[PDB]
Every structure is written in structure tokens, then in C-alpha cells.
């Protein structure tokens, strides 16, 4: 067999806005999620 | 209605193309000297048949009048210089 | 080589010398078992390499639109019908001989006018 | 947008034109060549002012104040 070409525009993905927001938003949300766990942590209700 | 279809850069690996429908779709058994000189369809084996060959182009390329009359780099410059170029952007 | 298993446990079969009767073994090393050696071979190296040319010659082969048809009648069935592969070794040093399949015997022929192969 | 007054090229009065090429062409069912012409249009300078002109204000107009 071949060698694998790393340049085979077919082995290749674009990230358009919905991915790079999808990214983005995660990592924000789960930052909130932290912070949701921590206010909970806080309530010594 | 299955009449086209899409194909990605890996399954592009596996059909065979004819790059005009007509001029490489029906058989043979005085030739315009003007023309440029083409390929036969020599292929049984066509599986599709590209919309139009000019459509391998962008938004710039696409602006520049018989691109196919310039020297390569010739295009690429263009392809850059009528982004600099004025005019009306939008109407409002 | 073509090298045999250690029946009962399916593990590799080592070689051990039974310098008694003079012959080749082959012992297993996860357990008791012993059985004579067929061949006097062992190990073989193979430097220069003639297989891997005819690689992925399915039936198939004739139902792939990317492959070239050719007018080369068939040496057995006598068929105008083809699909022809360069010799599929990926070695920088290979020849570009053609390898004819037949669309109707399924059999492979070449175009060299050297060497009278069976394969 | 808007008819240019006068060809560039030599200055011939093509700002009056336009109005009256429109209607040769919706009205007198006259192809663009034929119409041009008609107008009086007789150098190639004075005829693609009026041929190869884009009458944009009719969309600025649309933009109500
Ligand atoms: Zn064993
Ligand atoms: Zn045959
Ligand atoms: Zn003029």
C-alpha cells in the first residue's frame, strides 16, 4: 500500500460558524455549570 | 428525483466524469481551425457529468473575462485586486 | 515459511533440535507439546520480492467505472473485454507493465515481452 | 445611477437619451443595438454610456425618507 497523503482535501473538514460557536459555547456553559455547583456548595441552607 | 447529486472529495475517488454532457455523451464513424484542441469520451465507464466546468471557480475568478486566454498567476492577481476595486456595496 | 500451532492452547510453535534421531522439532513453549517439523526451512528472507502485484484482483474489479477498458483479446476465452491495473507493487523501483482481467473468464494476463509467468 | 450627462469620451448630450432608449425597448419592442441608433447614437464612446449604464437611483427611491 501507499503511504497516506495528509494533504487529500477529501481527509479535510471545515469548521463554519455553528462548530466554532458549538466550541465556544460549551466550554462557556460549563463554566456556568461550575459555578451553578459552587453556589450549591455556598448554600448551607 | 435523483437526477444530481452531492459528492464529497472522497467519494469523488470512485466515479468517472465527463467534463461536457453533448460534447463527450454520444459516438462516431471539415473541423473549425478557430477552436482549442479537446479530449475524446473514450469512457463507457461514466458515472456523472459535471454541471459546468466554469463553476470550479470562486466569487473573484468568476468576474474575470476569458480566464482561460491569461497566464495563471495573471488570474490569481485579479483575484485579489477586484476586492480593492470601488463601487456600489449595497444600495443602502 | 508457512508456519504451524501448538495445538490444545493455540500459541506459536518454536523449533528445538532433537540431536538424538538427528531431526527438527517444533516445541511449544506454553505447555508439553512437540510435533515433527514437515520441511527442513525454518526462516526465509526474500530480498527481492515478486508478490504483491496482483494485490486486490476481486471479482468485482470489472464493476470499477475508475479502471480503463482496453480491445486486448482474452489468451482462454477470447474476449475483446478488459480492465487493466499497472503492476500494483508500491515500490519506487517498478516496472509499468499492464495486467489484463477478463470481463467474461475472469483470468489475468500481461503485456510483457520478456518473461513467461503463471501469476 | 442616474444617466450621465454628456458621453465621456467626446461629450455628446446622452443625459437627455435615456427616458426615450427605455421606451424604445419596452414600447417599440426594438433590440438594444437597433434602439441606440435611434436615439442618434452613432460612436461606439456615446453608445456604451447609454448601452452599459445601471440606472441604481431607482433603487435608492424605494428607501422611503
Ligand atoms: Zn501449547
Ligand atoms: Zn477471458
Ligand atoms: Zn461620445
Not at chain 2, 482549442?36 to 474575470?64: K, N
Not at chain 2, 497566464?71 to 449595497?90: C, D, I
Request: glycine content about 4%; proline content about 5%.
Amino acid at each position: 500500500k501507499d503511504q497516506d497523503d495528509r494533504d487529500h482535501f477529501g481527509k479535510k473538514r471545515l469548521d463554519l460558524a455553528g462548530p466554532l460557536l458549538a466550541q465556544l459555547f460549551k466550554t462557556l456553559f460549563k463554566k456556568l455549570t461550575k459555578d451553578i455547583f459552587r453556589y450549591m456548595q455556598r448554600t448551607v441552607e | 428525483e435523483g437526477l444530481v447529486e452531492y459528492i464529497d472529495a472522497e467519494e469523488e475517488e470512485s466515479i468517472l466524469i465527463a467534463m461536457q454532457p453533448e460534447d463527450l455523451e454520444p459516438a462516431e464513424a471539415d473541423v473549425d481551425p478557430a477552436k482549442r484542441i479537446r479530449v475524446s469520451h473514450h469512457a463507457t465507464t461514466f458515472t456523472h457529468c459535471e454541471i459546468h466546468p466554469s463553476m470550479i471557480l470562486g466569487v473573484a475568478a468568476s468576474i474575470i473575462p476569458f480566464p482561460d486566454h491569461n497566464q495563471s498567476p495573471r488570474n490569481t492577481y485579479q483575484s485579489a485586486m477586484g476586492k480593492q476595486a470601488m463601487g456600489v456595496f449595497l444600495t443602502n | 515459511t508457512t508456519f504451524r500451532f501448538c495445538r490444545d492452547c493455540n500459541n506459536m510453535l518454536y523449533p528445538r533440535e532433537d540431536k538424538e534421531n538427528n531431526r527438527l522439532l517444533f516445541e511449544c513453549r506454553t505447555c508439553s507439546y512437540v510435533e515433527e517439523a514437515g520441511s527442513p526451512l525454518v526462516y526465509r528472507h526474500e530480498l527481492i520480492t515478486n508478490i504483491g502485484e496482483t494485490a486486490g484482483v476481486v471479482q468485482d474489479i470489472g464493476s470499477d467505472p475508475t479502471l480503463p477498458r482496453s480491445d486486448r483479446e482474452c489468451p482462454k476465452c477470447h474476449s475483446r473485454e478488459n480492465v487493466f491495473f499497472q503492476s500494483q507493487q508500491r515500490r519506487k523501483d517498478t516496472s509499468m507493465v499492464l495486467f489484463f482481467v477478463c470481463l467474461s473468464c475472469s483470468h489475468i494476463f500481461t503485456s510483457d515481452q520478456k518473461n513467461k509467468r503463471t501469476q | 445611477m442616474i444617466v450621465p450627462v454628456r458621453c465621456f469620451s467626446c461629450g455628446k448630450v446622452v443625459g437627455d437619451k435615456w427616458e426615450s432608449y427605455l421606451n424604445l425597448l419596452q414600447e417599440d419592442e426594438l433590440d438594444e443595438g437597433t434602439a441606440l441608433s435611434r436615439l442618434g447614437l452613432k460612436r461606439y464612446c456615446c453608445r456604451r454610456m447609454i448601452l452599459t449604464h445601471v440606472d441604481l437611483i431607482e433603487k435608492f427611491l424605494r428607501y422611503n425618507p
